């Protein structure tokens, strides 16, 4: 099962990467909503 090793790795790499993007977006959407006030 190369595929199961392969799925595991993408998942652990991807949990941080996508997490940052959604947190980045709300922090950033928050700051825009503060300016737009």
């Amino acid at each position: 099962m190369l595929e199961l090793l392969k799925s595991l790795v993408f998942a652990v790499i991807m949990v941080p990467v996508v997490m940052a993007i959604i947190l980045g977006l709300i922090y950033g959407l928050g700051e825009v909503f503060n300016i737009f006030s």
Partner: protein
């Protein structure tokens, strides 16, 4: 209820165990098929009248049968074609839900009573009555590679040695032979016949006499003479068995006493019944088997069993015979299955990773890893118990529900963890407190989701049958999910979660998790500070929301719609159309050139070409064909340029160059019944006995006007064939009577020689097979050959056909259609780009109203369904919408607060529309079911925020803003946890290429885009919604 099972973990574990057993059993007994039954039930009546012409078939068979389809039950419409090859097909289409077995028996029984009204020769061939289906499990080709067998030979071998064994194979429901067993072919020579003053009639008479079964009786049969000893059975004449015996048939004794044997005036050989279709596979003669899956059978097991049975026949094949598998949906279904298990498993691993990331202890992490599979298994148990199958639609229904199932697990567990950190309560009493906060909402959520998704089960017709694969999969998954969340996860939390010290939010941990925790607590302050500012100035955001909604409507109305995405199914067809009157040989040269292109320019991609000369979809005849191309497996065609769509376009472009033939490749529809989303199916009808010429002209009038609104109508065209030259031969009765030549000898001479005649049967190696007479090809090719056939007069003289006949060319129809028993002409077309089919249809109706007196129209097929089941749609959004609101009103005991939830809807839809518009996808059914799971989940998130806020205001007396901020603060984490897991879990589908990627792309991109915007926007806007709604009321 949750409290009951917090103190009864073993009872909850019993339930869970049951459910997994039931689900496990279901996993073993569930049928597996690519698609469920979709098209409404149809029955097809099919007859052959060998050597007949379209009008003769129509006027002596089709009209007779149609006139007797009376008193049959549940009939929506009936259609027919009669064509110039001597074939009629009558199709009766019944209301969805009609029992196909009963429908078929009522049609077959009315036919039976019409049989005495049809020609003897048509009665002798039979009229077949069958369930209409175009869904083959696989097509097995059988070919001969050493040039020692004709396809006539192969077909007989297949029929005699293979078909019956495949028919008996486990799970196969039907087998069609793509050929026919041998027949005894007697090829007549007119010059020899005349030499001996004989005619085809004489040959026919002799064969019927000397190849026949004659009853005799018995020795010592009852009543016996007393004293009789022996009782035996008398065998007299029995059927011939061999060409040698047929050749020895006695035809005449001359005056000198010499004998004329059949073989002296006819060539005799075993051959085919039909010489209409020449099938080749990479240039070699071929036959094949078309195999259909039985009801309730497993496709994967049956295909494997078929291959096993074929395997054990291989040792006995004659030299040069070889099995090939041009068409086999099973490999595709295998990948679909794997992809769906892979998806479910990855989802369970992602929830494990995300639970650990946020909660940082393995005990919490185990709980969804237990709950989710219990719900999945239990859902196959429910599914099976009303006998859905594992099919493509139900399989994607399962992945579209993953978000809802995962969210139920996360919500229950996270809330217990939160309560423990915020209060120091022991796991058991914290779970009790936690479940008290959300059990009401979870039930409310179950009602609301059941009011979004149930309504789509009740559409009608084919698209209704599709929607309800999804509707019942998802509703059962979601109902099992809430049951498990109220009984199993609470018990598990209470017994498996470890206590959390009051105030501990992990900010003082070391390494990564302390960092993560500090960082996330900080991120939560930002967000709430921002929400606080938003809530001090609600006006600007109501305007922003309206902007979003308008942008949603605009985006929506631009996105073109379809039904189901095309796939690289490993095959495509290419169609070959020559002009009128073109011969079999000309078509073969074009098919040969087509096959040569594929095996040469696409050498890497193409495994095989099955070139079938004589069979097309818009009509049959010598002048049409189809080359059916099968590819190497996806694994060896990497890259968008070696996929079907690419090959197709390149192929069609290369063939634009063939002159004197219309030749063009197209992909297969995912489901062959559905035609186009864009398209319509129009029937023009002769309602007052106008006649063929006038109907044709009315058709042409309509087609000319359609062509003048290219803004609205495109590709508006006839489905059928155009009049062609034919040969009018008039028999002069007076001259016939004056010569003493009987009309019956004349007409059977003509028909038997030029059309062929099925005389009777013989027995070839234990199997009954047909006998045919016909002229040798070389004496039935041209008008001058007419005068070479002689008939014997009453006075013994042989009279050439030219003495009593006259002949001229005229034009006539090689395919006559009827619709509900009136002559008809089918017209196809589609809406021009940017136009709805409704608009195109409305114009077609307008144009049709201006046609000649007596000419009417009707809408059929896909357009019948469109008309009736668009009528339905509005009433069902209305019922959905009302019940959603009524459930919310009960949940919150308020007539107004429900609006603060419902407003959340467009927030998910806008990101889904955006994702689809940007990737150039369409509004197809996968996108619209995804559009509904996204709405479901964001509605869920909002229901919990508003429930949390309201409880804070009602129970802890907090102010409007204070409660909203606190509620939104509490739900931030679980909302994020769920979104992270779902967006990641659906990511492989969005980027996926290869087999089934069309569907995977359709469900992934819309869901991921919607989940992004629903997540990011909802958390800012429902606190706005809640605050402005409470303020107004």
């Amino acid at each position: 209820m949750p409290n009951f099972f917090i103190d009864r973990p073993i009872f909850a574990w019993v339930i869970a165990i049951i459910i997994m057993l039931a689900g496990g059993l279901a996993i073993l007994k569930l049928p597996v098929a690519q698609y469920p039954t979709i098209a409404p039930p149809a029955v097809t009546i099919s007859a052959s009248y060998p050597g007949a012409d379209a009008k003769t078939v129509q006027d002596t068979v089709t009209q007779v049968i149609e006139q007797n389809m009376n008193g049959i039950d549940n009939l929506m419409y009936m259609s027919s074609n009669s064509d110039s090859t001597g074939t009629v097909q009558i199709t009766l289409t019944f209301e969805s839900g009609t029992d196909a077995d009963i429908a078929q028996v009522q049609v077959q029984n009315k036919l039976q009573l019409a049989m005495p009204l049809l020609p003897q020769e048509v009665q002798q061939q039979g009229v077949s009555v069958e369930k209409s289906s175009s869904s083959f499990l696989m097509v097995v080709g059988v070919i001969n590679t050493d040039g020692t067998m004709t396809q006539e030979d192969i077909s007989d071998y297949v029929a005699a040695n293979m078909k019956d064994a495949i028919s008996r194979t486990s799970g196969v429901g039907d087998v069609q032979l793509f050929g026919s067993q041998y027949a005894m072919r007697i090829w007549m020579n007119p010059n020899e016949l005349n030499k001996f003053q004989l005619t085809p009639v004489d040959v026919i008479t002799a064969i019927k006499a000397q190849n026949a079964q004659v009853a005799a009786g018995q020795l010592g049969g009852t009543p016996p003479v007393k004293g009789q000893q022996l009782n035996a059975s008398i065998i007299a004449q029995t059927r011939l068995t061999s060409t040698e015996e047929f050749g020895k048939i006695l035809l005449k004794v001359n005056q000198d006493g010499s004998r004329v044997l059949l073989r002296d005036v006819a060539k005799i050989e075993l051959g085919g019944e039909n010489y209409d279709i020449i099938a080749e596979f990479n240039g070699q003669p071929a036959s094949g088997l078309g195999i259909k899956l039985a009801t309730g059978a497993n496709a994967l097991d049956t295909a494997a069993a078929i291959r096993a049975e074929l395997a054990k026949m291989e040792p006995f094949f004659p030299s040069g015979l070889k099995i090939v598998y041009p068409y086999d949906t099973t490999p595709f279904v295998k990948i679909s299955i794997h992809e769906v298990v892979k998806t479910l498993v990855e989802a369970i691993i992602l929830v494990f990773l995300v639970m650990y990331l946020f909660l940082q202890n393995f005990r919490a992490t185990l709980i969804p890893t237990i709950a989710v599979p219990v719900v999945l298994l239990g859902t196959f148990a429910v599914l099976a118990a009303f006998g859905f199958s594992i099919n493509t639609l139900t399989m994607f229904g399962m992945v579209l529900a993953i978000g809802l199932l995962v969210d139920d697990a996360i919500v229950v567990v996270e809330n217990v963890e939160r309560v423990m950190a915020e209060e120091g309560l022991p796991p058991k009493e914290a779970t009790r407190k936690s479940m008290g906060q959300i059990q009401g909402a979870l039930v409310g959520i179950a009602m609301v989701l059941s009011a979004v998704f149930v309504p789509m089960a009740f559409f009608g017709g084919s698209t209704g049958a599709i929607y309800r694969q999804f509707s019942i999969t998802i509703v059962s998954a979601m109902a099992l999910s809430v049951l498990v969340a109220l009984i199993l996860t609470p018990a598990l939390c209470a017994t498996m979660l470890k206590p959390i010290a009051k105030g501990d939010h992990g900010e003082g941990k070391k390494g990564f998790f302390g960092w993560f925790n500090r960082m996330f607590e900080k991120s939560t302050h930002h967000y709430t500070d921002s929400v606080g500012g938003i809530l001090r100035s609600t006006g600007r955001y109501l305007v922003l929301y309206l902007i979003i909604v308008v942008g949603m409507a605009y985006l929506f109305v631009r996105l073109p719609s379809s039904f189901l995405p095309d796939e690289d199914q490993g095959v495509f067809m290419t169609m070959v159309q020559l002009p009128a009157g073109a011969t079999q040989e000309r078509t073969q040269k074009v098919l040969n050139e087509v096959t040569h292109y594929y095996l040469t320019k696409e050498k890497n991609n193409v495994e095989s070409v099955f070139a079938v000369n004589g069979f097309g979809f818009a009509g049959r005849g010598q002048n049409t064909g189809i080359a059916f191309v099968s590819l190497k497996d996806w694994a060896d065609r990497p890259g968008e340029e070696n996929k079907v769509e690419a090959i197709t376009m390149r192929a069609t472009r290369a063939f634009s160059q063939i002159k004197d033939a219309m030749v063009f490749a197209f992909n297969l529809p995912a489901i062959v019944e559905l035609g186009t989303a864009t398209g319509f199916d129009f029937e023009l009808i002769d309602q007052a006995g106008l006649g063929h010429e006038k109907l044709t002209q009315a058709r042409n009038q309509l087609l000319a006007e359609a062509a003048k609104h290219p803004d609205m109508l495109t590709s508006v065209r006839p489905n059928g064939l155009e009049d062609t030259p034919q040969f009018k031969i008039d028999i002069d009765q007076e001259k016939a009577q004056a010569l003493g030549v009987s009309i019956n000898d004349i007409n059977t001479t003509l028909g038997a020689a030029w059309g062929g005649s099925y005389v009777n049967d013989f027995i070839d190696r234990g199997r009954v097979k047909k006998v045919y007479v016909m002229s040798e090809a070389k004496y039935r090719m041209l008008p001058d050959d007419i005068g070479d056939w002689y008939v014997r007069a009453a006075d013994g003289q042989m009279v050439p056909f030219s003495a009593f006949s006259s002949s001229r060319w005229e034009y006539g129809s090689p395919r006559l259609e009827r619709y509900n028993g009136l002559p008809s002409m089918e017209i196809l077309g589609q809406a021009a780009p940017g136009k709805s089919t409704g608009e195109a249809m409305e114009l077609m109706e307008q144009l049709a109203s201006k046609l000649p007196t007596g000419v009417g129209y009707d809408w059929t097929g896909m357009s019948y369904q469109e008309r009736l089941s668009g009528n339905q749609a509005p009433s069902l959004y209305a019922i959905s919408l009302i019940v959603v609101f009524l459930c919310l009103a009960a949940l919150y005991e308020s007539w107004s607060i429900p609006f603060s939830v419902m407003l959340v809807v467009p927030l998910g839809v806008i990101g889904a529309l955006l994702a689809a518009t940007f990737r150039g996808l369409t509004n197809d059914v996968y996108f619209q079911v995804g559009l509904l799971t996204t709405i479901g989940l964001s509605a869920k998130n909002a229901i919990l925020i508003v429930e949390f806020a309201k409880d804070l205001m009602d129970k802890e007396g907090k102010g409007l803003i204070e409660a909203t901020l606190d509620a939104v603060r509490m739900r931030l984490r679980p909302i994020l946890m769920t979104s992270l897991a779902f967006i990641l879990g659906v990511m492989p589908l969005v980027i996926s290429t290869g087999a089934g990627s069309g569907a995977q792309n359709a469900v992934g991109t819309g869901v991921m885009g919607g989940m992004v915007t629903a997540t990011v926007l909802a958390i800012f806007f429902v606190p706005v919604f809640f605050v402005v709604v409470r303020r107004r009321f």
